[PDB]
Amino acid sequence: LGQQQVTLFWSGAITGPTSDAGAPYGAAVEDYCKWANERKLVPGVVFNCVVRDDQYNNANTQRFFEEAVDRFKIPVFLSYATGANLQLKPLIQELRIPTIPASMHIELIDPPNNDYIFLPTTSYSEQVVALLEYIAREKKGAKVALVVHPSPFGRAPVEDARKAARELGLQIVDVQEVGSGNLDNTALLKRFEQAGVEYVVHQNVAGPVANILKDAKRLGLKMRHLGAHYTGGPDLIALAGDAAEGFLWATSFYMAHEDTPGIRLQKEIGRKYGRPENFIESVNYTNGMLAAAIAVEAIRRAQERFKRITNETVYQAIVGMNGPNAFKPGFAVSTKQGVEIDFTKSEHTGAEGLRILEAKGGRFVPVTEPFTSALFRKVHYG
Amino acid sequence: LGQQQVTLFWSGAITGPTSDAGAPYGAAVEDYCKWANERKLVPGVVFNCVVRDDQYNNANTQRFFEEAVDRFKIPVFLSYATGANLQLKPLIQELRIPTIPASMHIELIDPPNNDYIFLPTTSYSEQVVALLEYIAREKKGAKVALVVHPSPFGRAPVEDARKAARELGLQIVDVQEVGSGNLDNTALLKRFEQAGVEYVVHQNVAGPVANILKDAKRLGLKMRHLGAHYTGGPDLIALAGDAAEGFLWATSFYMAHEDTPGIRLQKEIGRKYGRPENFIESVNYTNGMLAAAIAVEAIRRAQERFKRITNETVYQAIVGMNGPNAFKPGFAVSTKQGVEIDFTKSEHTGAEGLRILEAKGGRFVPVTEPFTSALFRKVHYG
Ligand code: NA
Ligand code: NA
Secondary structure, three states: OOOEEEEEEEEEOOOOOOHHHHHHHHHHHHHHHHHHHHHOOOOOEEEEEEEEEOOOOHHHHHHHHHHHHHOOOOOOEEEOOHHHHHHHHHHHHHHOOOEEEOOOOHHHHOOOOOOOEOEEEOOHHHHHHHHHHHHHHHOOOOEEEEEEOOOHHHHOOHHHHHHHHHHHOOEEEEEEEOOOOOOOOHHHHHHHHHOOOOEEEEEOOHHHHHHHHHHHHHHOOOOEEEEOHHHOOHHHHHHHHHHHOOOEEEEOEOOOOOOOHHHHHHHHHHHHOOOOHHHHOOHHHHHHHHHHHHHHHHHHHHHHHHOOOOHHHHHHHHHOOOHHHOEOOOOEOOOOOOOOEOOOOOOOEEEOOEEEEEEEOOEEEEOOOOEOOHHHHHHHHO | OOOEEEEEEEEEOOOOOOHHHHHHHHHHHHHHHHHHHHHOOOOOEEEEEEEEEOOOOHHHHHHHHHHHHHHHOOOOEEEOOHHHHHHHHHHHHHHOOOEEEOOOOHHHOOOOOOOOEOEEEOOHHHHHHHHHHHHHHHOOOOEEEEEEOOOHHHHOOHHHHHHHHHHHOOEEEEEEEOOOOOOOOHHHHHHHHHOOOOEEEEEOOHHHHHHHHHHHHHOOOOOEEEEOHHHOOHHHHHHHHHHHOOOEEEEOEOOOOOOOHHHHHHHHHHHHOOOOHHHHOOHHHHHHHHHHHHHHHHHHHHHHHHOOOOHHHHHHHHHOOOHHHOEOOOOEOOOOOOOOEOOOOOOOEEEOOEEEEEEOOOOEEEOOOOEOOHHHHHHHHO
């Protein structure tokens, strides 16, 4: 009765490892929550916006989550790191709070302790398998190398890739872990060239990838580079410049240059709060805005249906978010079959479609229609 | 329960332009704050820590500042951008609020509206002048170029530099402005070589400087590179690696590898709160902790002397911070006759000494004792 306070809490890497993505992501959550208040998107609710920088340290994330459950009574958890989410799964499950991660690791929505975790988009695995499919269409028996961030995040899609490579007749000849501060990748690239690698697939944030491309260009190599969600967009172009030309990127998001109410809104909100241009255009600002938008829309549905806002009512709002009752903010693509954001008790992936985009003269251009990977489902679910 | 709440407010670039510096700086403010609470530095008071990311946008900084005055009645301001500080001097003077900036621009403490602003360390102008002095004893009549950040921060020491150079018989042949995303610095460096530049002095953060060093190393160039406070430290090493070998750097801080209670405190505080290792060694983590330590010691002394914590009593505790009451936390160097941190109504610079250090084997090594530049006082004050 009257205005109530509701806490929207995100914990992730505004600084520290992976912060190329966590900074714009965190910023979008804070901004959207700010916009929810100004436009009164949820009648009778003022959002208390809590955005914590855990710097990719799982102990910081746990402490911030415990504080947020105990003190702020959160009905939802906007989370970040793969490693952190893996570690908190038992506790998330125990206290039944719906959790929407920036991490797209499929293991998060696999048993046990998976009833409350909802992936806004396709997983690292589907992305990587989608890219491998694209590789096998180009060139049979292609030699491919994986380069991966040194963490549970980098390692996430490695097993689905090996088994997909096997199914497609490709050979994964190496897998290397490369983190930030990779000033000189000469040795690694020379190793790949000796072994006849022809395609390098990346699972990383954009700074390590950019460094590798810069060196690749410098040395004049012919291997093609591809990458999953966090590797690309305008961020990669800004760090790699022309060394990005021809990079192939798998993602569920619309680009900054496409026409969508959601992309339009990201721009409007970004300018409103004076974000720098490169935040406004980041695909990760889009990514955070979708996560906060999902949370804010489930809170709204909870208010309309139950007139009470709890982990339980918010849960019920999310698992009813399907069919004609799906959420279509225009942030991510949809299959010509499907809708944009839809969940059920048994379907925990929001935007199940993705595309492959190619970097051309400084901009990522779609070279596919939205699609789902049946190959991913065979190798992963059997 | 029952404890007096004192708000410690900082606004700066946690992300956006200059964030290579602002992030560790803001992290140190927050941590020194948590630590004051853990240890109850000031009896009967709890510090509430408001650390805000303005992304180097002056409009955000001003809005954050006004809000913190209205809602928290802050007794001190920890500020950041040189540009934001220049714009706020009248309001700071109006509010009679001691302001301790990250910015070291000498013009902040020049009249008018300069009564409430205190530099913790040496200014940009004296660092640049000190460096030009190092150049003239090595090579009479040397050709030098200045490369600066494209903002008031970058341009801050240029007039003192021109003045000094002319006193020394050096020829400043070019001043260039380069910001972040300077991926290719070839055109600029080639223009330097054709102009016969033999020394490059940088006024900048670490990222752009690093990009220039790596290009210069690729091109086999032999100009010597030098830089003011924000250009160097373990952060420049991490970004530039070997290309930084030989860089000459002017700062007032102790190094991470030196032995000091203050440096010991920063490692202990940083590991206590799970900061990444690179933040913990950052000189800008040291720099922010000094700023926060001064703010906290002044509040402490105000409490003890006056039984009230206000903008007025904090100010009195700052201008009495001299002689027998000078402050010696051990973050910054002192001269032999001198002392670490001392202010008067008339002396608004804390640690007046600086050193020149040289990068050898990925570590900055002092190459001088602490000193002050008479030449700087000649050109700037007469
Ligand atoms: Na779905
Ligand atoms: Na002094």
